[PDB]
Amino acid sequence: AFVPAAHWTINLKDADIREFIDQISEITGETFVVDPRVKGQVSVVSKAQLSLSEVYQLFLSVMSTHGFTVVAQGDQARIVPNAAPDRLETRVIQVQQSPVSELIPLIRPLVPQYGHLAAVPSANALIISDRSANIARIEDVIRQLDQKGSHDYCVINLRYGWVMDAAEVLNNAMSRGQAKGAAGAQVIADARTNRLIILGPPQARAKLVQLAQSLDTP
């Protein structure tokens, strides 16, 4: 259930989706007619405190995650099916130092197609839907990116190379101190498009981009 923290926190595990909806009505005061086809088990977690409006946003993210949407029929609000692993958790992740919008494109490559990613700018938080072990891993990536001063980035679409090989070569070179002028830059592999995302301060990023290009030469 939602626990007062008017703000609230939540730690609901393996609950019927219908229970979650009813719970949202109790807090919001909104009333929903739930289509008979709406079914499923949900896990919803927020250690960050949420306002009433942010709770509604979380509700929409959970609905969207499981393929449902809210419509108006017959003078009432209706939850209906909209046109993946069994256990999915929807977690709210608060970001401390950086604006959430700047981190979104850097973490999208870690979100699977079945998953969900949304910004909650009023709380400077991200909503992510995934299996719990995947979420913990992403939370660490967020924590690390959040410590960085810059989130500017360059994208390289590899024509010849395999994205994982290239990422491995670039990280090892930096680890060994073998990348000259790129120390401080960082690489993120984005397999779905066979592309690299290079980030860092201007001079280091410009050098790592050049180095990355050399791994993709015909």
33 near its own copies (CB under 8 A): no
The residue (of 1 and 155) whose beta carbon lies closer to its own copies is 155
105 near its own copies (CB under 8 A): yes
The residue (of 62 and 120) whose beta carbon lies closer to Ca ion is 62
**Only segment of 11-19, 21-29, 138-146, 156-164 that touches its own copies (CB under 8 A):** 156-164
Q: Which of 15, 27, 34, 70 binds its own copies (CB under 8 A)?
A: 70
The answer to whether the beta carbons of residues 171 and 183 sit under 8 Å apart is no
Q: Six-digit token pair at 41?
A: 């088990």
147 near its own copies (CB under 8 A): no
202 near its own copies (CB under 8 A): yes
The contacts found for 103-106 with CB under 8 angstroms, 24 or more apart, are 103/142, 103/145, 103/146, 103/151, 105/153, 105/197, 106/145, 106/151, 106/153, 106/188, 106/197, 106/199
Q: Which residue's structure tokens are 């924590």?
A: 143
72 near its own copies (CB under 8 A): yes
76 near its own copies (CB under 8 A): no
Q: Six-digit token pair at 73?
A: 């029929």
**Only segment of 18-26, 56-64, 87-95, 162-170 that touches Ca ion (CB under 5 A):** 18-26
Contacts of 114 (CB under 8 A, 6+ apart): 84, 85, 88
The answer to whether the beta carbons of residues 61 and 118 sit under 8 Å apart is yes
CA distance 53 to 129: 19
The residue (of 81 and 85) whose beta carbon lies closer to its own copies is 81
Q: Which residues sit at the interface with its own copies, rule CB under 8 A?
A: 35, 37, 60, 69-73, 78, 80-83, 101-102, 105, 150-157, 159, 192-193, 202, 206, 209, 213
